Write a protein that binds this ligand. Structure first.
Ligand SMILES: [Mg+2]
Ligand SMILES: [Mg+2]
Ligand SMILES: [Mg+2]
Ligand SMILES: [Mg+2]
Ligand SMILES: [Mg+2]
Ligand SMILES: [Mg+2]
Ligand SMILES: [Mg+2]
Ligand SMILES: [Mg+2]
Ligand SMILES: [Mg+2]
Ligand SMILES: [Mg+2]
Ligand SMILES: [Mg+2]
Ligand SMILES: [Mg+2]
Ligand SMILES: [Mg+2]
Ligand SMILES: [Mg+2]
Ligand SMILES: [Mg+2]
Ligand SMILES: [Mg+2]
Ligand SMILES: [Mg+2]
Ligand SMILES: [Mg+2]
Ligand SMILES: [Mg+2]
Ligand SMILES: [Mg+2]
Ligand SMILES: [Mg+2]
Ligand SMILES: [Mg+2]
Ligand SMILES: [Mg+2]
Ligand SMILES: [Mg+2]
Ligand SMILES: [Mg+2]
Ligand SMILES: [Mg+2]
Ligand SMILES: [Mg+2]
Ligand SMILES: [Mg+2]
Ligand SMILES: [Mg+2]
Ligand SMILES: [Mg+2]
Lengths: 128, 187, 53, 147
RNA sequence: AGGGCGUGAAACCGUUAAGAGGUAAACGGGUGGGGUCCGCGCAGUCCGCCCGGAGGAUUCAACCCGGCGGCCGGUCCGGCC
RNA sequence: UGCGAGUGCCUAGUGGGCCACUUUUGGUAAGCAGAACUGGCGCUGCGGGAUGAACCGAACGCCGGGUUAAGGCGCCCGAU
RNA sequence: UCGCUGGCAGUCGGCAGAGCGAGAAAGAGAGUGGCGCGGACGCUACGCCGCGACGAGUAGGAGGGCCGCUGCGGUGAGCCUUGAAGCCUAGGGCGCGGGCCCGGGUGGAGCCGCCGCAGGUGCAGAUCUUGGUGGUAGUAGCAAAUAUUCAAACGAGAACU
C-alpha cells in the first residue's frame, strides 16, 4: 500500500482541455502555445459564438487543491539525498521527484533514503 | 448590469514605503503595530509620513523649529520631525531642545548638544511615549523646492508670475516680444 | 516638434560629429606613462630637485 | 537596464504603442524647433514669451573678470570668522571690536538683509550698501573701505 | 560514424499498422465507441490511547556520585563597556 | 433625495467619423449634401428581427438550480 | 480586483489562570480606614486571516510574472561517460496562461537552480532575406530546311557506331 496524504478532498477543475492558439490546426508554422490574438477583425478576440475560448482569470483553480497531484500530494524536485531531510517534516503533504539528470547509482540511494524517511516518490523505479 | 463607473475605485495612496532601507522597514513594523493597537492618531500620522517620499518630507531647519517651539504654551515638549533637521547658520542663540528625528546633520547635532538638548530616534520616542503625548509634530516647507515656481498658470498669460524654462538668464534670452510693450504686446 | 511646457534647446549635432569622437579609454595608460617618464627624469637628474628650478 | 524598460512589454502589440490611425512617421512637424513663427506659434507664445526679437545694447568684448563682484549678507557676516572670535569679543569688557575682512573670505560687496547681533564690528570690505551700512552703524561699529 | 562520413529537426515522400470516407477539408462545446499505454490495481487505509491474553528484557519510581546547561542573589563578590 | 471630498504634477492616443426618434436648410429625390438634442456603432460579445455594424431586449469572470425581457408555441425548431 | 488605508507581535502557561462581538463614552485597577508536571495549528509580517461590492473593451496607459533566451558576479560540499546538451514520443502530470516537471527512445561531453547584474532577448505576415521542399505533373513539350532500308562485324548490350 502506498503512502496516503493527510487529506484527500475532491479535486474540481474548471476545465480539462488546453487552450490552443487560434489557427494552430491549419499551419505547421503556428504552434499550439497560446498567443493572445490582437487582430482588428478577429472573431476569437471579439468572442463570437462557437469559436476558440480564451484563458480568463475565471478558470483559476481552487486554492486549497491547487498544484495538487491526483494522489493528493504536491511535487518537489530532488537532485541529491541532502534535500530529503527538507521533506522529512513536510511528510504528509509533499512528495519528491528525482531530477532527470541524476544517474542510476544515486537514484537508488535517494529511493532507499526516501523509503526510510516515509517520503513518497512518484518515480521510484525510473531507470533501474 | 450596474450603472456605475470604475474610474476612481482604486485609491492611489502608498501602502508601504517605496524604499528598501531595512532600518526604515523596522520602524514601519513598529509603528504599524502601534497605530493598529492604540487609539492615538499621532501614530497614524507618523507612519503615514514614514511611507512618504523625500519631496514629501522636506528638511526642517533649526530656525523654524526654534520659532515653533518658542510659540507660547508649548514649553518643554518634544519636537518631532519625520524628515531631516538641518543646521541654520543665520541663528545665534540655541535654546534647550528635545528633538526626535529620522536623521540630524552633524553640525545641527553639535549645536543642539552643546546647547544642552537631547536627540532621539523613533524607537526611543516609542519607548518614551507610545501615544506621542507631549509632542509637537512639525514638518518642513513642502513647496520650498525650486520646481514649484515653474508650476501653475503658464508663463506668457495675463497675470501669471510663473518662472519660464530658459537655458540661461541674460539680455538675449526670452525678453523681447511677449515681455515688452514696444516689441508687439505684453502678456 | 515642441510639446507642453519645456525648455527650447540647441544641440550642436548638425555637423558630422561621429567621424571624430575622442574617447578616453587610454587615460590610465597615459597616466602610467607620464609618471614613469617623470620617475625616469627624476632619477636621471640624480641630486637635483624633481620639480625643477 | 533594458530588462526594466517599456520595449519589453510591447512585444506582441502591433503598433508598439504609437497607434494605428496616425502611424509613427519620421518628422511630422519639421526638424528641431522649426515653425516657431508659423505652426508652433501658440506653443511658443504660451510657454516662451519674449523669445523672438531684440532688445538692449551690444557689448563686443565682454569680460566677466571685470564684471566680477560677489556679495555677502549681514546674516552670513559672522560666519566668516571662527565662533571663538565672537565668544571672546562678547565676553571681553574692554570694548575691542573684531575685524571682519570679507575680501579674505572671497566677497567684495556687503548687502544688509537680516538682523545683526548686538556686538561691535569693524567690517573691512570693498563696497557697501546704504542699508548694510546703517545696520552696522546701529549695532555700533565701523565700515572701512579697501581697494 | 562507410571517405561532403558528429548530432540529424520541419516542410515533402515510401512502406507497415489502426481507423474512416456521397455536402472540400479543418475547427469550438457535449458525450459515446474503439485503441495505445499507465495504475505495477485485482479482496484494500491506517494513526494514537485504553481493556483483555499469551510472551520477552537487567527494567521503572525513589536515593547516591560526577559532568553540563537555564534562571536567579530583595543589595554575594569581581570585572568590562 | 442621493453621495466621502479637495488639490498638484507628468502624460499617451486622438484631431477622416457613421447611424437612429423628434427639430431642420439645399435639392424633384436619393443608401444625397449640411446642422441642433439625446442615444448608439466605431471599441461589443449575447436573446429576437430567417439573413444584416448601428433595430427591439439586454450589456459579459468559470459554473449548478430557478425565473423572466423582446420575440414566440403546425413541422423544420424549444413551446398551445 | 478593489475597498474596509479591517484583524493578528497575546505562542501574555505551574514565575500559569486562558476574555475583549458587544445597542447606547470611559478600569477582569491597586491599595487606607470606617497528588498526577500537562496544554493542536500558527506569524516566509514583502506573511497569514476576515468581511462587503465588483469583473465588456480597439487606440493608449500602468502593475505582476516561481514566464522564456544569452552572458557576468555570487551561491547550491549542485548535476554528469552507471551518460550532459540537443532531438522524437498514441507515456504520467502541474499551471487560467506565458510555460514547466517526470517516463521511454536516440544521442556522446558538458549543464542547471537560487540571489543580484547586463543585453544584438521571444515572429505569421513586411510583393521581408537566405537555404530547402511540394501541387501543377510523369504534364507542357522534345514538329523550320523532302529520307531512309538491308546484311555483316565488334560488343554484355545496336533505330542511332
Ligand atoms: Mg471593427
Ligand atoms: Mg456584473
Ligand atoms: Mg471599464
Ligand atoms: Mg483610473
Ligand atoms: Mg506628441
Ligand atoms: Mg491593446
Ligand atoms: Mg505612446
Ligand atoms: Mg499599420
Ligand atoms: Mg501623429
Ligand atoms: Mg489622419
Ligand atoms: Mg519620432
Ligand atoms: Mg554517430
Ligand atoms: Mg550523419
Ligand atoms: Mg509515415
Ligand atoms: Mg489501410
Ligand atoms: Mg448626412
Ligand atoms: Mg477606426
Ligand atoms: Mg464606449
Ligand atoms: Mg452593443
Ligand atoms: Mg426580415
Ligand atoms: Mg442558468
Ligand atoms: Mg420562429
Ligand atoms: Mg477588463
Ligand atoms: Mg567526442
Ligand atoms: Mg550579446
Ligand atoms: Mg526566429
Ligand atoms: Mg517564419
Ligand atoms: Mg510520357
Ligand atoms: Mg505528352
Ligand atoms: Mg528543330
Amino acid at each position: 500500500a502506498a503512502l496516503r496524504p493527510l487529506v484527500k478532498p475532491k479535486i474540481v477543475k474548471k476545465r480539462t482541455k488546453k487552450f490552443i492558439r487560434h489557427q494552430s490546426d491549419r499551419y505547421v508554422k503556428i504552434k499550439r502555445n497560446w498567443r493572445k490574438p490582437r487582430g482588428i477583425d478577429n472573431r476569437v478576440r471579439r468572442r463570437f459564438k462557437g469559436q476558440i475560448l480564451m484563458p480568463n482569470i475565471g478558470y483559476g483553480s481552487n486554492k486549497k487543491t491547487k498544484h495538487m497531484l491526483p494522489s493528493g500530494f504536491r511535487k518537489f524536485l530532488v537532485h541529491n539525498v541532502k534535500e530529503l531531510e527538507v521533506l522529512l517534516m513536510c511528510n504528509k503533504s509533499y512528495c519528491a521527484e528525482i531530477a532527470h539528470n541524476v544517474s542510476s547509482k544515486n537514484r537508488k540511494a535517494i529511493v532507499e533514503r526516501a523509503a526510510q524517511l516515509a517520503i513518497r516518490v512518484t518515480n521510484p523505479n525510473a531507470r533501474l | 448590469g450596474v450603472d456605475i463607473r470604475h474610474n476612481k475605485d482604486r485609491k492611489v495612496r502608498r501602502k508601504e514605503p517605496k524604499s528598501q532601507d531595512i532600518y526604515l522597514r523596522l520602524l514601519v513594523k513598529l509603528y504599524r503595530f502601534l497605530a493598529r493597537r492604540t487609539n492615538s492618531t499621532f501614530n497614524q500620522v507618523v507612519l503615514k509620513r514614514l511611507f512618504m517620499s523625500r519631496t514629501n518630507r522636506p528638511p526642517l531647519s533649526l530656525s523654524r523649529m526654534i520659532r515653533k517651539m518658542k510659540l507660547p504654551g508649548r514649553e518643554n515638549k518634544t519636537a518631532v520631525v519625520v524628515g531631516t533637521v538641518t543646521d541654520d547658520v543665520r541663528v545665534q542663540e540655541v535654546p534647550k531642545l528635545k528633538v526626535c528625528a529620522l536623521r540630524v546633520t552633524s553640525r545641527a547635532r553639535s549645536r543642539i548638544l552643546k546647547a544642552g538638548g537631547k536627540i532621539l530616534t523613533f524607537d526611543q520616542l516609542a519607548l518614551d511615549s507610545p501615544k506621542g503625548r507631549g509632542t509637537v509634530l512639525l514638518s518642513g516647507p513642502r513647496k520650498g523646492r525650486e520646481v514649484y515656481r515653474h508650476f501653475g498658470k503658464a508663463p506668457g498669460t495675463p497675470h501669471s508670475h510663473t518662472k519660464p524654462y530658459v537655458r540661461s538668464k541674460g539680455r538675449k534670452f526670452e525678453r523681447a516680444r511677449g515681455r515688452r510693450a514696444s516689441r508687439g504686446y505684453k502678456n | 516638434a515642441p510639446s507642453r511646457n519645456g525648455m527650447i534647446l540647441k544641440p550642436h549635432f548638425h555637423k558630422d560629429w561621429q567621424r571624430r569622437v575622442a574617447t578616453w579609454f587610454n587615460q590610465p595608460a597615459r597616466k602610467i606613462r607620464r609618471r614613469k617618464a617623470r620617475q625616469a627624469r627624476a632619477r636621471r637628474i640624480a641630486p637635483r630637485p624633481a620639480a625643477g628650478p | 537596464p533594458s530588462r526594466l524598460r517599456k520595449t519589453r512589454k510591447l512585444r506582441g502589440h502591433v503598433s508598439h504603442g504609437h497607434g494605428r490611425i496616425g502611424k509613427h512617421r519620421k518628422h511630422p512637424g519639421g526638424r528641431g524647433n522649426a515653425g516657431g513663427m508659423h505652426h508652433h506659434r501658440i506653443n511658443f507664445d504660451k510657454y516662451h514669451p519674449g523669445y523672438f526679437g531684440k532688445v538692449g545694447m551690444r557689448h563686443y568684448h565682454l569680460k566677466r573678470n571685470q564684471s566680477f563682484c560677489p556679495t555677502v549678507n549681514l546674516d552670513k557676516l559672522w560666519t566668516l570668522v571662527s565662533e571663538q572670535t565672537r565668544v571672546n569679543a562678547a565676553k571681553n569688557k574692554t570694548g575691542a571690536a573684531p575685524i571682519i575682512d570679507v575680501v579674505r573670505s572671497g566677497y567684495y560687496k556687503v548687502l544688509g538683509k537680516g538682523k545683526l547681533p548686538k556686538q561691535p564690528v569693524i567690517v573691512k570690505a570693498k563696497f557697501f550698501s546704504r542699508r548694510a551700512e546703517e545696520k552696522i552703524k546701529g549695532v555700533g561699529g565701523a565700515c572701512v573701505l579697501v581697494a
